[PDB]
Amino acid sequence: SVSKANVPKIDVSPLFGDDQAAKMRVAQQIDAASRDTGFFYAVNHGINVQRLSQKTKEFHMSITPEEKWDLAIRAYNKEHQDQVRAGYYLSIPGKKAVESFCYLNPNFTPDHPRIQAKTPTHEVNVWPDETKHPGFQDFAEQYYWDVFGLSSALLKGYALALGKEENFFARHFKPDDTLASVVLIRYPYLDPYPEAAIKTAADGTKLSFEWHEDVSLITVLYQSNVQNLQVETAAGYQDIEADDTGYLINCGSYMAHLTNNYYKAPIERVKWVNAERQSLPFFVNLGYDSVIDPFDPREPNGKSDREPLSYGDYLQNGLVSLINKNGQT
Ligand SMILES: CC(C)[C@@H](NC(=O)[C@H](CS)NC(=O)CCC[C@H](N)C(=O)O)C(=O)O
Ligand SMILES: [Fe+3]
Give the span between the Cα atoms of 16 and 32, in whole angstroms: 20
Give the span between the Cα atoms of 168 and 217, in whole angstroms: 12
Amino acid at 263: Y
Residue nearest to atom 22 of ligand 1 (CA): 279
- Cα 25 to middle of ligand 1, angstroms: 30
**Contact (CB, 8 A) for 151 and 249:** no
- Cα 214 to middle of ligand 2, angstroms: 4
Tell me whether residue 122 is exposed, middle or buried, using C-beta atoms within 10 angstroms of its C-beta: 0 to 12, 13 to 18, 19 or more: buried
What separation in angstroms does the CA of 92 have from each of 89, 119, 149, 304, 306?
A: 10, 31, 35, 46, 42
What separation in angstroms does the CA of 255 have from each of 229, 266, 291?
A: 21, 11, 12
- Compute the 3-state secondary structure of the chain and give helix, strand, coil in percent, each to the nearest 5: 30, 20, 50
- Structural domain total, the chain: 1
**Which of 182, 209, 222, 326 best tests ligand 1's pocket when mutated (most atoms within 8 Å of CB)?**
209
- Cα 268 to middle of ligand 2, angstroms: 6
Q: Is 301 left (phi over 0), alpha (psi -120 to 50) or beta?
A: alpha
Beta strands in 141-197 (DSSP E): 181-187
- Cα 303 to middle of ligand 1, angstroms: 32
Residue nearest to atom 10 of ligand 1 (CA): 214
Any idea which ligand is nearest the CA of 228? 1
Give the span between the Cα atoms of 122 and 104, in whole angstroms: 8
Give the span between the Cα atoms of 284 and 155, in whole angstroms: 9
Q: What domain range includes position 118? A: 1-329
**Contact (CB, 8 A) for 187 and 229:** no
**Contact (CB, 8 A) for 67 and 79:** no
Best CA proximity match to 76, nearest among 85, 89, 93 = 89
Pocket of ligand 1 (CB under 6 A): 85, 102, 181, 183, 185, 209, 212, 214, 221, 270, 279, 281, 283, 319, 322, 329
Q: Do strands 229-233 and 267-271 pair parallel, antiparallel, or not at all (unpaired)?
A: antiparallel
**3-class state of residue 278 by DSSP:** strand
- Cα 183 to middle of ligand 1, angstroms: 7
The Cα angle at residue 130 between residues 127 and 131, in degrees rounded to 5: 145
Best CA proximity match to 124, nearest among 75, 68, 80, 186 = 80
Radius of gyration of the chain (CA): 19
Q: Do strands 3-4 and 236-239 pair parallel, antiparallel, or not at all (unpaired)?
A: parallel
Method of determination used here: X-ray
What separation in angstroms does the CA of 224 have from each of 52, 166, 248?
A: 11, 31, 11
**3-class state of residue 269 by DSSP:** strand
Long-range contact set of residues 305-312: C-beta below 8 Å, sequence gap at least 24: 306/257, 306/258, 306/260, 309/254, 309/257, 309/258, 311/172, 311/179, 311/254, 311/285, 311/286, 311/287, 312/119, 312/120, 312/121, 312/179, 312/287, 312/288
Give the DSSP H/E element, type plus range, for residue 219: strand 218-223
Amino acid at 94: G
